[PDB]
Amino acid sequence: DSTYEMIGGLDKQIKEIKEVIELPVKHPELFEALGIAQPKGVLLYGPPGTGKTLLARAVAHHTDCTFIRVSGSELVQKFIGRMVRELFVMAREHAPSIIFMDEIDRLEGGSGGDSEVQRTMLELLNQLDGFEATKNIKVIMATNRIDILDSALLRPGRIDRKIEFPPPNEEARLDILKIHSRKMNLTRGINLRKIAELMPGASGAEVKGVCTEAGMYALRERRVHVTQEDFEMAVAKVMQKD
Amino acid sequence: GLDNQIQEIKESVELPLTHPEYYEEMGIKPPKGVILYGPPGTGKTLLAKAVANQTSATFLRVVGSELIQKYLGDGPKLVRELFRVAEEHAPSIVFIDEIDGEREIQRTMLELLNQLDGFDSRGDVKVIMATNRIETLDPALIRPGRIDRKIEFPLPDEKTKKRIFQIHTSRMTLADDVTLDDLIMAKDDLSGADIKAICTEAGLMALRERRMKVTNEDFKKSKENVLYKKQEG
Amino acid sequence: DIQKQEVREAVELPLTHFELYKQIGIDPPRGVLMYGPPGCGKTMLAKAVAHHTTAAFIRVVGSEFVQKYLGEGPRMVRDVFRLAKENAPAIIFIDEIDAIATKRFDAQTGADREVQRILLELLNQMDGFDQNVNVKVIMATNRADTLDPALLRPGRLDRKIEFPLPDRRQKRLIFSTITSKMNLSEEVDLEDYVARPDKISGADINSICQESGMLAVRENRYIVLAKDFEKAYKTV
């Protein structure tokens, strides 16, 4: 589900995005007094914020809409489907929907089939740019990895939305790390404040790096509860690759 | 400030298929069309000028010429398909927008040059060309398309943006301190989507305090984002 | 003294301590990936790990499920996975994944998208069964560029044992575990006989040694010597 109880730290950005996404949801009457239309979407460029998808699944979970991705990372690639019209038919039947690519986030064949997917979403943006079947059809890009150059280059911020997202709120390092500590078995004498604030410079992926790279020492010592010293070692275990 | 211009070109484009007593009996027959262009471009200015013909008619929209470079050099065959479907769909209006090895581009450009003129075709449909800048394209495309008259985009004459602002604000709620002369005079080379964009973000910014009425200080405060954004790059 | 301890505690410890991972709440990683176009392998480590423990094992040929069937795939992989998690703890060795991990735009070739939906389907089922599944799944490949980012994504393959430059200890190990079953002597030495196949990159070196056993099985010489090694290297 990944509701608001599993994502936090972007209060200003959800306060700014409720007018981009939540506008056709609960207050569509401002079309006369304001004169707004359906934009292309929104994207967040920079380091991985450990929850780049939990936000889309969160707003989509509160909008009470379906989540249909394009690349089909989890058994949703051929379930719907020239494999280009079935997505628009399911988008016509299911008017509330949020599209977010996660799997896309050799240069000869990988850019060949990946160039076929890019041409697919380009002609889909041409069909949706020319005509429109129903509302509440918006696409969201993902620029968090290094191999993402087409989405960052083709979206400079001229006819789309752009958000500077290197330093989200420092809660992408602190409070979503606390949330990632709520799921796993957490003790009561831990202080995530210092170990969460003392990881500067490297990247924003310190949450997933310290959790996943700390699971090898919680798997080595076989401790029933995760201690702060495990995360302290995980800081070095993720700073060695820098 | 372009009502006489839009009615002059409107009469220049509505004489075929309508009002025939001064079209074929007297012998006008301009079977070539016109060519348009806008310095701001964006397709919304030329779309707002040619949209007067889209009220009661059949329209065709082909934007950009990327479909030639993105694939192998198939040639003008797609233009021939548009020509045969324009012949089978004579009661329509042809409009092309965003008109932007080397030996093939020249031969398909000369073939498109002779095809656009229509040496073996009389007046059956009207063709209107559009691009970002007329200076970038080769001047050879003038004689086939533009043989009647051409028009350039005027200046902020304080009447066009005032009329468009009146249409967009025919039902909006604005305070008394919201003057118009500073707005229509301060702006320069802005399309309808720019004033509609600053009005949209102005009402959306005034909605942050449940204020159904937009003030002038919030309108200029919202305009600071567009004026600052256009000067950043 | 760290490779055998990391792989040791990453292979034999999670194999019979699932309840302890249920207590601590940490999923044990089991995906071991092999890569490197120069060194083929897929036999020394696959049969070494597949023979360190005397239990059941179910190997699969790279084209074991490519029968252009849409509904038979999940039944085959579900039956193999249920006999592997229910019959006995086995180490499944999936080979030739580059032919089943290729995307295609045209929907007319539904068999390729179908088999990549099978590979991605078991790739999702292994993700949903990370909570102490009773099966080990190792994987090997030679062309990772054609592979999809979902295979090399973390959480699936957390171990990547490469073969760029093995030291002498790995030569004594991977060559002792193969010379222990063959006839050795004081002249049998494969250090230069493995350094040369690194200059001239040759595949399936272990299979070439088996060919040397096929040339020494003629009952003309009991102990295999350098003549069949260098001969098996210059011929095949």
Side-chain angles (χ1 to χ4, degrees):
Chain A
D1 291 331
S2 70
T3 184
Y4 282 162
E5 294 293 327
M6 296 297 172
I7 185 68
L10 297 175
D11 55 355
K12 295 292 289 184
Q13 296 184 0
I14 64 171
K15 185 68 173 66
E16 289 180 353
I17 209 66
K18 279 188 285 291
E19 297 88 4
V20 177
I21 306 298
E22 295 292 327
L23 190 144
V25 176
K26 295 180 177 66
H27 49 281
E29 293 87 4
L30 56 93
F31 291 163
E32 181 67 28
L34 273 74
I36 200 167
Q38 293 85 18
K40 296 292 183 181
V42 72
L43 58 94
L44 286 80
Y45 73 99
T50 68
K52 63 184 183 293
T53 311
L54 297 175
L55 182 62
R57 194 176 177 88
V59 179
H61 181 74
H62 292 87
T63 318
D64 291 331
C65 65
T66 185
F67 182 75
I68 297 169
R69 66 191 69 191
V70 175
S71 179
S73 177
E74 41 101 21
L75 219 268
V76 289
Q77 54 185 356
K78 201 177 78 69
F79 182 76
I80 298 170
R82 198 169 63 245
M83 295 297 291
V84 299
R85 189 63 59 85
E86 293 292 328
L87 192 144
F88 190 75
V89 173
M90 293 299 291
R92 186 187 298 115
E93 182 179 1
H94 295 284
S97 178
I98 299 298
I99 298 169
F100 177 74
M101 284 74 74
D102 187 74
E103 178 64 30
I104 202 167
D105 194 1
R106 180 174 172 84
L107 200 63
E108 186 177 1
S111 68
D114 198 2
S115 179
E116 291 293 328
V117 178
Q118 290 298 112
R119 188 67 64 194
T120 299
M121 62 183 69
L122 279 174
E123 68 183 1
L124 284 174
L125 287 173
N126 290 319
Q127 292 179 356
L128 271 71
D129 187 74
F131 286 162
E132 182 179 1
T134 186
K135 274 78 69 178
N136 296 114
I137 303 298
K138 297 180 187 293
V139 293
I140 297 170
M141 282 65 253
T143 303
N144 291 109
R145 289 285 88 192
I146 301 98
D147 205 2
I148 303 298
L149 294 174
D150 188 76
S151 296
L153 193 144
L154 270 70
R155 301 291 180 89
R158 180 75 269 172
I159 49 95
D160 201 359
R161 187 68 177 172
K162 189 64 63 66
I163 295 169
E164 186 260 338
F165 202 73
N169 205 2
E170 191 67 28
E171 267 89 7
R173 196 175 295 166
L174 268 67
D175 79 345
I176 204 63
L177 177 61
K178 186 181 289 292
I179 296 299
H180 288 89
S181 296
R182 289 182 183 270
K183 296 180 177 67
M184 63 184 73
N185 291 318
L186 185 63
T187 185
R188 293 181 184 271
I190 192 166
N191 192 359
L192 293 174
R193 298 290 180 89
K194 55 180 73 174
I195 200 65
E197 286 178 354
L198 266 68
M199 299 184 291
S203 65
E206 292 292 328
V207 176
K208 291 176 71 175
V210 166
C211 291
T212 58
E213 286 293 327
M216 297 298 107
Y217 286 99
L219 189 142
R220 182 180 181 271
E221 194 67 28
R222 302 288 173 89
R223 287 192 296 269
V224 68
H225 64 279
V226 176
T227 188
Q228 186 179 2
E229 197 270 336
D230 193 0
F231 292 166
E232 192 271 331
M233 291 299 291
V235 173
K237 291 296 288 183
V238 303
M239 285 178 71
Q240 284 298 109
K241 291 182 180 180
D242 293 329
Chain B
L2 49 90
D3 54 355
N4 197 2
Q5 180 178 0
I6 198 166
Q7 76 182 357
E8 193 271 332
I9 194 166
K10 180 71 173 177
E11 184 67 28
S12 179
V13 303
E14 284 292 328
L15 191 59
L17 198 136
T18 58
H19 194 276
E21 67 267 20
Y22 287 166
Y23 174 70
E24 62 183 1
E25 294 293 327
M26 196 173 288
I28 303 297
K29 192 178 89 275
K32 299 295 182 183
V34 296
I35 295 173
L36 302 177
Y37 60 93
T42 325
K44 201 262 186 295
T45 300
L46 295 173
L47 192 144
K49 290 182 180 180
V51 77
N53 294 319
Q54 297 178 358
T55 61
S56 295
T58 304
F59 185 76
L60 184 63
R61 184 183 62 84
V62 176
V63 171
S65 296
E66 190 177 1
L67 52 92
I68 299 297
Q69 293 180 356
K70 70 184 286 184
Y71 196 70
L72 199 268
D74 185 72
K77 288 177 68 66
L78 278 77
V79 183
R80 294 180 185 271
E81 293 179 353
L82 294 175
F83 183 75
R84 64 179 175 87
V85 78
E87 183 178 1
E88 293 292 328
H89 290 88
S92 297
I93 292 96
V94 177
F95 180 75
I96 304 169
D97 192 73
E98 290 292 328
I99 299 168
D100 291 330
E102 186 177 1
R103 63 180 177 88
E104 185 179 3
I105 302 169
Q106 185 177 2
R107 68 184 68 188
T108 195
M109 184 179 71
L110 185 63
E111 182 68 28
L112 183 62
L113 183 66
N114 196 3
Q115 184 179 2
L116 195 144
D117 186 74
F119 181 77
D120 56 354
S121 179
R122 292 180 66 189
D124 185 73
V125 73
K126 298 295 289 184
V127 176
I128 299 169
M129 293 175 70
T131 187
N132 290 318
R133 185 179 295 275
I134 199 66
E135 294 293 328
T136 61
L137 294 175
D138 291 331
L141 294 172
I142 296 169
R143 291 291 300 273
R146 188 263 181 190
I147 203 66
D148 182 74
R149 190 178 178 89
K150 66 183 291 294
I151 53 98
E152 201 264 328
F153 178 71
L155 294 175
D157 293 331
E158 84 100 20
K159 298 181 290 295
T160 298
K161 294 180 182 179
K162 186 175 180 180
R163 179 67 178 171
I164 296 169
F165 182 75
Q166 183 66 41
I167 295 169
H168 283 87
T169 60
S170 295
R171 292 180 184 270
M172 291 175 68
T173 62
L174 54 94
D176 188 75
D177 59 355
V178 182
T179 60
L180 277 76
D181 197 2
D182 57 353
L183 299 176
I184 63 179
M185 185 177 176
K187 295 188 289 290
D188 186 74
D189 291 331
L190 273 78
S191 66
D194 292 331
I195 184 166
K196 185 174 73 175
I198 63 172
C199 289
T200 299
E201 70 184 1
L204 187 63
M205 190 66 205
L207 192 63
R208 296 289 299 274
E209 293 179 354
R210 293 178 292 174
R211 292 184 291 113
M212 63 184 73
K213 177 173 66 67
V214 176
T215 61
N216 198 1
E217 60 183 1
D218 186 74
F219 191 80
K220 299 186 293 294
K221 183 172 70 68
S222 66
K223 185 67 173 66
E224 195 271 332
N225 195 2
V226 171
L227 183 63
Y228 181 75
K229 180 67 173 66
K230 65 178 73 175
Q231 293 179 356
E232 193 271 331
Chain C
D1 291 331
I2 60 170
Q3 184 178 2
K4 293 187 286 185
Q5 190 68 41
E6 183 69 27
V7 175
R8 193 70 59 85
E9 292 181 354
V11 167
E12 76 175 4
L13 267 70
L15 188 62
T16 180
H17 294 89
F18 295 105
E19 293 86 4
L20 188 58
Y21 297 112
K22 292 294 290 183
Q23 292 179 356
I24 65 171
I26 290 95
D27 293 331
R30 83 281 294 153
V32 175
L33 183 62
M34 291 184 284
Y35 184 67
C40 182
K42 293 189 286 184
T43 302
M44 292 183 286
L45 294 175
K47 289 182 182 178
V49 177
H51 280 286
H52 275 93
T53 61
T54 61
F57 292 97
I58 301 298
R59 66 184 68 188
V60 287
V61 185
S63 179
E64 91 276 22
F65 67 96
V66 182
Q67 284 79 240
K68 72 183 181 293
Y69 287 163
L70 57 95
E72 190 67 28
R75 291 181 178 91
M76 289 185 289
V77 299
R78 185 177 294 114
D79 286 331
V80 172
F81 284 166
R82 74 182 294 275
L83 68 90
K85 74 177 73 175
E86 194 270 331
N87 193 1
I91 299 170
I92 298 169
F93 178 75
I94 300 169
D95 196 0
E96 292 179 353
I97 61 171
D98 56 354
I100 62 170
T102 303
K103 65 179 72 66
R104 185 67 178 87
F105 178 75
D106 290 332
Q108 290 85 18
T109 61
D112 183 71
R113 192 174 179 87
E114 199 274 331
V115 297
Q116 80 175 354
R117 189 178 178 179
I118 294 170
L119 182 64
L120 195 143
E121 182 176 359
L122 57 92
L123 186 64
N124 195 2
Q125 290 178 356
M126 67 179 287
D127 290 332
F129 288 164
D130 282 327
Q131 191 68 42
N132 286 315
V133 68
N134 299 115
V135 63
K136 300 291 180 68
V137 176
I138 60 172
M139 192 177 289
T141 187
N142 55 3
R143 294 175 65 189
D145 55 354
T146 62
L147 297 177
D148 290 331
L151 294 175
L152 276 75
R153 193 181 71 84
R156 281 84 170 271
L157 297 173
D158 291 331
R159 264 68 173 170
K160 292 181 181 179
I161 299 170
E162 296 293 328
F163 199 72
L165 283 174
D167 289 330
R168 299 294 180 92
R169 296 291 184 269
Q170 287 82 17
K171 300 294 184 184
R172 290 182 179 178
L173 292 174
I174 207 165
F175 279 98
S176 67
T177 190
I178 198 66
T179 199
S180 296
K181 282 90 172 65
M182 293 179 183
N183 297 115
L184 56 93
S185 178
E186 66 182 1
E187 193 178 1
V188 176
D189 195 0
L190 280 79
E191 294 179 354
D192 56 354
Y193 291 162
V194 78
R196 183 177 182 271
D198 186 74
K199 306 296 182 292
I200 39 108
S201 179
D204 59 20
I205 301 299
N206 195 1
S207 297
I208 302 169
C209 295
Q210 292 180 356
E211 292 293 328
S212 178
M214 292 179 183
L215 270 72
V217 80
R218 205 177 296 113
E219 287 92 8
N220 289 319
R221 187 176 64 191
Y222 290 163
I223 297 170
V224 58
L225 294 173
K227 285 185 177 180
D228 291 330
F229 289 160
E230 194 271 331
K231 186 180 290 293
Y233 289 162
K234 66 181 181 180
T235 55
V236 64

